[PDB]
C-alpha cells in the first residue's frame, strides 16, 4: 500500500555512543550493535521516544535519535520500571545504573577487581581463567586456550 520515496538525507552509517551503527536495518535491531543495549531494551527506548519503529536506521530525523539516546542514558527518570536495567542497586552508589558501550566493558573489569582484591573465590577463579559458576571442567571447554 504505502510506497515512499526515500530522499538524499539518508545515511549508510551513523554514530551514537561512539559506535559505527550500520544503517539499512530496522532501528531497534540496529541499535543493538551498541554494547549495553539488547533487543528488549532497544524496543523500550524507541517506544518511550515515540518513534515509528517500522523505519530503517538510516532514515530517521536528527532530533529523534538524540531524543532516543537521552532516554537510554537517563532511563528511570523517563518511567522505565528499573528492574529492566542491567546494573541496578549498585554496590557503591546504591542507585540503578545502565552502562552503555564502554561502561559495560570498563565496569565489568572493575567489579572483577574487587573479588581479586579481597581474594574472593570467584576472583581467584577468574585470575586462573577457569569457570566460576560451578561447572564441571574435567571434559568441557577443553581447547578454550
Amino acid at each position: 500500500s504505502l510506497v515512499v520515496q526515500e530522499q538524499g538525507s539518508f545515511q549508510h552509517i551513523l554514530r551514537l555512543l561512539n559506535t559505527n551503527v550500520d544503517g539499512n536495518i530496522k532501528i531497534v535491531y540496529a541499535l543493538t550493535t551498541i554494547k549495553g543495549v539488547g533487543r528488549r531494551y532497544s524496543n523500550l527506548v524507541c517506544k518511550k521516544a515515540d518513534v515509528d519503529l517500522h523505519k530503517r536506521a538510516g532514515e530517521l530525523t536528527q532530533e529523534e535519535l538524540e531524543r532516543i539516546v537521552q532516554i537510554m542514558q537517563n532511563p528511570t527518570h523517563y518511567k522505565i520500571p528499573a528492574w529492566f536495567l542491567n546494573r541496578q542497586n549498585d554496590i557503591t552508589d546504591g542507585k540503578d545504573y545502565h552502562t552503555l558501550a564502554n561502561n559495560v566493558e570498563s565496569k565489568l573489569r572493575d567489579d572483577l577487581e574487587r573479588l581479586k582484591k579481597i581474594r574472593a573465590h570467584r576472583g581467584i577463579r577468574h585470575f586462573w581463567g577457569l569457570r566460576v559458576r560451578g561447572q564441571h571442567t574435567k571434559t568441557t571447554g577443553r581447547r578454550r586456550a
Binding site: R40, N43, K47, L53, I80, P81
Partner: protein, 143 residues
C-alpha cells in the same frame, strides 16, 4: 436465523471485535502495556504494540462464550508456549498472570463477563447480547 459467535471464523471475529474495542475506547488498559512481554516463556513483547490488549480481550471474550466458566489459571495455560531453555530441551511455561486477571477485571467494567457461582468468570447477558451482534456484523462482510 439467529447467527451466533459459533457461526463465524475465530480469526476474523476476534479481529473484528478487537477493532470494535479500539473505536469504543473504554477498556481500562493497565498502564504497564508496551513494557511487558505477557509470558515468562516468551522472548519479545507483542509486535502489534499499539493494540493487543484489545486483541487479547476479544480472544478472552470468545472463550467464556464457548465454555461455562474460566479462571485466570486456565488462561495462563492456554496462552503459554514452549520456552526455549537455552541448550536444554523445551518445556511448557505459563503466561503472565497479571495480563489475564486485569483484562478479566477490565471486561467486568464494560459488563461483558461477570463473576460466577462455583468460582470463576461467566459471560453475562450483556456479554451474550453484543457478541452475537458483532457476529451478525462481521459475517456479512464477504456477503
Amino acid at each position: 436465523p439467529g447467527v451466533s459467535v459459533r457461526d463465524v471464523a475465530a480469526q476474523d471475529f476476534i479481529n473484528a471485535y478487537a477493532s470494535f474495542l479500539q473505536r469504543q475506547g473504554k477498556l481500562e488498559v493497565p498502564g504497564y502495556v508496551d513494557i511487558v512481554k505477557t509470558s515468562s516463556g516468551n522472548e519479545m513483547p507483542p509486535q502489534d504494540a499499539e493494540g493487543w490488549f484489545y486483541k487479547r480481550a476479544a480472544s478472552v471474550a470468545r472463550h467464556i462464550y464457548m465454555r461455562k466458566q474460566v479462571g485466570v489459571g486456565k488462561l495462563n495455560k492456554l496462552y503459554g508456549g514452549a520456552k526455549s531453555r537455552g541448550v536444554r530441551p523445551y518445556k511448557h511455561i505459563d503466561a503472565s498472570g497479571s495480563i489475564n486477571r486485569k483484562v478479566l477485571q477490565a471486561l467486568e467494567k464494560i459488563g461483558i463477563v461477570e463473576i460466577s457461582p462455583k468460582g470463576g468468570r461467566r459471560i453475562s447477558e450483556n456479554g451474550q447480547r453484543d457478541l452475537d451482534r458483532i457476529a451478525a456484523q462481521t459475517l456479512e462482510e464477504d456477503e
